Amino acid sequence: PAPHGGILQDLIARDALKKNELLSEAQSSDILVWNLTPRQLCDIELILNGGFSPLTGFLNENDYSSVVTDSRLADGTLWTIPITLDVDEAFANQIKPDTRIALFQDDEIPIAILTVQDVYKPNKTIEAEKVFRGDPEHPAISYLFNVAGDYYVGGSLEAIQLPQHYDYPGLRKTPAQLRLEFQSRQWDRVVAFQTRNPMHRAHRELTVRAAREANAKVLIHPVVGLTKPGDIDHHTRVRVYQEIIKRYPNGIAFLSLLPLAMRMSGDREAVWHAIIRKNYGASHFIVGRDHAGPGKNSKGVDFYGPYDAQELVESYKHELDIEVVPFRMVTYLPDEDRYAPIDQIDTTKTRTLNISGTELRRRLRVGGEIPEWFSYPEVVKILRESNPPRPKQGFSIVLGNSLTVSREQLSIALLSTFLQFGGGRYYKIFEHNNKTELLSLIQDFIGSGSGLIIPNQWEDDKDSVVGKQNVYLLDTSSSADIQLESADEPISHIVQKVVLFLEDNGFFVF
Amino acid sequence: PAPHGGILQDLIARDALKKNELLSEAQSSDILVWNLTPRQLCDIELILNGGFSPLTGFLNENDYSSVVTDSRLADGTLWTIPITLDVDEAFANQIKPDTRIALFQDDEIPIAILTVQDVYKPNKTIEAEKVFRGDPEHPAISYLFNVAGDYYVGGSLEAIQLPQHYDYPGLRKTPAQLRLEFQSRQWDRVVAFQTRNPMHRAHRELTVRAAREANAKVLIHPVVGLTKPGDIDHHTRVRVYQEIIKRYPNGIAFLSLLPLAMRMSGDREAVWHAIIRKNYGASHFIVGRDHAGPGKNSKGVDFYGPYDAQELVESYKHELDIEVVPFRMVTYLPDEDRYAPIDQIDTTKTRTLNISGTELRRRLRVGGEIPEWFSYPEVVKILRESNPPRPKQGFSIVLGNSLTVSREQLSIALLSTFLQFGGGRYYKIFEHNNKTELLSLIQDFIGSGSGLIIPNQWEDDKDSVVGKQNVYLLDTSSSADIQLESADEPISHIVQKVVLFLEDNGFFVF
Ligand SMILES: [Ca+2]
Ligand SMILES: [Ca+2]
Numbered sequence A, B: 001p002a003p004h005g006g007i008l009q010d011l012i013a014r015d016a017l018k019k020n021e022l023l024s025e026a027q028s029s030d031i032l033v034w035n036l037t038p039r040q041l042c043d044i045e046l047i048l049n050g051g052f053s054p055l056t057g058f059l060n061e062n063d064y065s066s067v068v069t070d071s072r073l074a075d076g077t078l079w080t081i082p083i084t085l086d087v088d089e090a091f092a093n094q095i096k097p098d099t100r101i102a103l104f105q106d107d108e109i110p111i112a113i114l115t116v117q118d119v120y121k122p123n124k125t126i127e128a129e130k131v132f133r134g135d136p137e138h139p140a141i142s143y144l145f146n147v148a149g150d151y152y153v154g155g156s157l158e159a160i161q162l163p164q165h166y167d168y169p170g171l172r173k174t175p176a177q178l179r180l181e182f183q184s185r186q187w188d189r190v191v192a193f194q195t196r197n198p199m200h201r202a203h204r205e206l207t208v209r210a211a212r213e214a215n216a217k218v219l220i221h222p223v224v225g226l227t228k229p230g231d232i233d234h235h236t237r238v239r240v241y242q243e244i245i246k247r248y249p250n251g252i253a254f255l256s257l258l259p260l261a262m263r264m265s266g267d268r269e270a271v272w273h274a275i276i277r278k279n280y281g282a283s284h285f286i287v288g289r290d291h292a293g294p295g296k297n298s299k300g301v302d303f304y305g306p307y308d309a310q311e312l313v314e315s316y317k318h319e320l321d322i323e324v325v326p327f328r329m330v331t332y333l334p335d336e337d338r339y340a341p342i343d344q345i346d347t348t349k350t351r352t353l354n355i356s357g358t359e360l361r362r363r364l365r366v367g368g369e370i371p372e373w374f375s376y377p378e379v380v381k382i383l384r385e386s387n388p389p390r391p392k393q394g395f396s397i398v399l400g401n402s403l404t405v406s407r408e409q410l411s412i413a414l415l416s417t418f419l420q421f422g423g424g425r426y427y428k429i430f431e432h433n434n435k436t437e438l439l440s441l442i443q444d445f446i447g448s449g450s451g452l453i454i455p456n457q458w459e460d461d462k463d464s465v466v467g468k469q470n471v472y473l474l475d476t477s478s479s480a481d482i483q484l485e486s487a488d489e490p491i492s493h494i495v496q497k498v499v500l501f502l503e504d505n506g507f508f509v510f
């Protein structure tokens, strides 16, 4: 269907003949520069390539306010997620309306020139409540307060070039490009599938049934910008998509990556996804259970109800101009060797099997088997590689502050001991000297599968620098992972405690 | 580089706003229609999509003659293979210059309107000698005399649509389309690889080295129109390409299909391939040993010298405007587990292994093993499927005219006997009654793996209707595949002769 607002605002194409001129202005000595944050790069790419039609810049306060309370742009155009350029006070003060500023990437690549319409300090409590529902634990609110700038700069954009990406150049289709790809194949009915996760047999099955019921071709449009915190990296995920797309019948599916920065804003985001896919050329879209929802908070309560998304999108059905296909999740029937829509089988009368994310995570952590009815083997092989089991995981042993035995000798004892065991893990007694440049290397070593022995703890005002994954404290204190019987426990006893701890946790296997 | 002649003659785009008008004219009652032959569909698709720039129609006699003797269009543009619309006398007579005729596909799909410039009867002996070197066994000369019409119609083309194809819609990129695909990936150095065969490890290796030496991305551009007689079907081949393209390092290669009708015209064709790839957007091209050559004739003599192609292309180097990368064939070194350029190793000092086409064919016929150093397993699996070994091959036993035993009983005996054996082959006593509609089904059954028992021979004026592959004559005559001791040999003896013959030939395995 036609782009939201009727026109594809592909600013790259619009400004093609001003590229040199704009590029030269961006590189002028007198122009004020702003370095785009990683989320802003995600947003500006979608504005510049028309992914966010009718947007043609970051929202000024007039539009922003309507989006916050009315879920629309001041002109009444449905638009549920505010896209603004958040800056700090120091920069906001240097700019006034009509000021033209340059937006760079990595402090070296000019992306666009923004003509300032306004500068304002939004009430983040209202946005937090109105747009994201108010739970301080909602990733969007966390970002809203802890990362986002306190001042929004609204203004019209002029394009120099889209944010630079060196990976998957072939798959990052812009709206215009994707539309031409469909057009060259004569596809005029396309159902799009959103995801920020690996795809298993069930996803393959459900998307194909969608294709069959909507009489449409399939578009697997995964998000590769910012997704939920803790999600699997997009490189791993792209590898999985590239693998699963080969499992569809020839000529029925197309894989294209979307550099979107999700807010995990549930029902509002679901609407936004529909609009965005319409701009990219899809005729149909599937909205899932708790679509774009971040789940439950600490108190175990739902950030959104499982059907809020589908209900909200349905309420805007008459103006979305993109058909929404009903979400029919499928489950595996052992006794019939097939998948079937969950709404068609009687739980208490028919056998069904499925592997929850929690269980999948466990199996991967212990190197256990994962059945082909759940996920294709080539897909599982990829997941095991990016997330190796414990015998292949790195780790660190931190000699606590309470230790009175010789740190130099205990570290040497641990090294010599670990080195006896096989498995190929690399070991290092690592001294950081409380230097940040060294502390930041700890998780890289662990990520590399290495075993580090750290002679002493770093200062508390440095915790933030070190990731806590697979990092274990050896100390007399109660908060120690490997508790010492006493501060002067004999080195050989300590060594045993560590070895058996690592064994119990799967790092060593004999 | 720029299209040959400087302009991409994409007539589909040129005539976009006349499509309805032209379509309506093509469907008029008074317009004279011509049904395009399968080769003409191959040629018109390349003319219409700019693949043959600067051509904009089929060659008139003025241009055709220059191509025949001068290897150029009358304007002096390098062009080595004549592309003409060959028709029979009955049609040629109905047309005069300025006559507008419609060119259809399958007698139902209008492709273009041709404005006749001239009608002429070419001297096919000169073309045969000058363009194709004169050997009556050259596939182009065979076609030239036995299939091609005796009258050439020269004229300008106007596009309605490209020849319809329902398979691989995604991979059939036109010149403009491919150029945009390279442009979107920022590829400006692309080396193209021509082929009408399956690709094995050696081809993968040599194309990647080409990429490394030319500092270019790779374009695997296989021909899927008409290639050499006896070649493997393009469906099988496309399956292989789609498989091998996955073996290149990510982002280095692109697969696009070329609907060219090869003439197997060696050095002239090599030049033509360079021009064509330049039009499709390649900056580089590899010309191989005996490139586009059909091999040797009956007397075992070479249709072309192995380096005629490379030498001819090199002589036109200063006007081709596309770099030709030297052809460095590679061979496998067992002792080093690697492939290396054949021009770098000493045959008598270093071990090298390779599997000729003949040997590959044998292994496939007997279901023998084919090593991974030769071809990737997923590629070999595909070849085995399209070309199954003898235990999975169909066949036919024809009861010769010399037989005096009861044909009804011998056929029944053979059936009952074959049915004892396992293997899943399907059997049928097939009566054709000398009817063409039934005879043409024989190879379909054999192609399906079936075993047919044919009670009597068909008339000689029908031989042509039946393919001779895996068809065996049971007769007393000397020209019989399974020779009877006598015309009245006992049925049980005959049955044994047939069973043991089929066993010796691998159809049955116990
Ligand atoms: Ca703040
Ligand atoms: Ca719930």
Ligand SMILES: [Ca+2]
Residues within 6 Å of the ligand: A488
């Ligand atoms: Ca003590």
Ligand SMILES: [Ca+2]
Residues within 6 Å of the ligand: B145, B149, B150
């Ligand atoms: Ca003739």
Ligand SMILES: [Ca+2]
Residues within 6 Å of the ligand: B302, B306
């Ligand atoms: Ca030779």
Ligand SMILES: [Ca+2]
Residues within 6 Å of the ligand: B488
């Ligand atoms: Ca007798």
Ligand SMILES: [Mg+2]
Residues within 6 Å of the ligand: A045, A162, A163, A164, A165, A172
């Ligand atoms: Mg980009």
Ligand SMILES: [Mg+2]
Residues within 6 Å of the ligand: B045, B162, B163, B164, B165, B172
């Ligand atoms: Mg076509």
Ligand code: NA
Residues within 6 Å of the ligand: A001, A002, A321
């Ligand atoms: Na519409």
Ligand code: NA
Residues within 6 Å of the ligand: A194, A195, A196, A197, A203
């Ligand atoms: Na999913």
Ligand code: NA
Residues within 6 Å of the ligand: A304, A305, A308
């Ligand atoms: Na609710």
Ligand code: NA
Residues within 6 Å of the ligand: B001, B002, B321
């Ligand atoms: Na040039």
Ligand code: NA
Residues within 6 Å of the ligand: B194, B195, B196, B197, B203
């Ligand atoms: Na080849």
Ligand code: NA
Residues within 6 Å of the ligand: B304, B305, B308
């Ligand atoms: Na020669």
